[PDB]
Write a protein that binds this ligand. Sequence first.
Ligand SMILES: CC(=O)N[C@H]1[C@H](OCCCn2cc(CN([C@@H](C(=O)O)C(C)C)S(=O)(=O)c3ccc(-c4ccccc4)cc3)nn2)O[C@H](COC(C)=O)[C@@H](OC(C)=O)[C@@H]1OC(C)=O
Ligand SMILES: [Ca+2]
Ligand SMILES: [Ca+2]
Ligand SMILES: [Ca+2]
Ligand SMILES: [Zn+2]
Ligand SMILES: [Zn+2]
Length: 157
Amino acid sequence: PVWRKHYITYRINNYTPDMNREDVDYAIRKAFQVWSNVTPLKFSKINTGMADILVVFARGAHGDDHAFDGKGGILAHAFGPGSGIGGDAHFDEDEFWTTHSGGTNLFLTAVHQIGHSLGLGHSSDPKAVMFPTYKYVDINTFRLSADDIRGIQSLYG
Ligand SMILES: CC(=O)N[C@H]1[C@H](OCCCn2cc(CN([C@@H](C(=O)O)C(C)C)S(=O)(=O)c3ccc(-c4ccccc4)cc3)nn2)O[C@H](COC(C)=O)[C@@H](OC(C)=O)[C@@H]1OC(C)=O
Ligand SMILES: [Ca+2]
Ligand SMILES: [Ca+2]
Ligand SMILES: [Ca+2]
Ligand SMILES: [Zn+2]
Ligand SMILES: [Zn+2]
């Protein structure tokens, strides 16, 4: 249930019009960084070819048999480690993605979904990033909880 290599590629398949491109790239890259800070994994954005983790913005039905649901409800989903669609993280474009507190924060959502792309389940600690409910936390004080660190290190340490 894990990536069996420690150099992992991602590609941004497409950009949400909600946010400037620069802010999308920065959110995503920072989100990956959160995990590469507590494991030996290295993440590399690529701009051509097939990436391990593909990052997709889409609405409703988008060709994976798990349609999204409009504004609210499900925000995003992600497939666990594997080939093809494995690892891929999809973000519901009917949300309003933002760099701060308005709408839904892309960074925080990405940290969570990349958790799942890496093989994590959910946490019972409301402080954890892998807690199952979205809430805006102070990104200046953001930090992985002990539960996240133990989970991720059990897979990749
Ligand atoms: C679990 C849940 O909250 N479901 C909500 C319900 O969701 C239906 C789908 C059930 N569900 C939710 C999830 C968790 N999500 C994904 C996940 O775990 O990644 C999976 C689909 C892959 S998620 O989209 O909801 C999700 C994504 C990111 C995060 C996250 C982001 C940042 C930090 C931490 C967590 C949390 C949840 N799994 N199944 O929608 C309803 C309507 O939504 C509106 C208008 O906001 C919710 O009603 C509200 C807000 O009161 C409803 O709340 C209830 C009763 O469960
Ligand atoms: Ca939705
Ligand atoms: Ca993949
Ligand atoms: Ca949107
Ligand atoms: Zn999908
Ligand atoms: Zn989740």
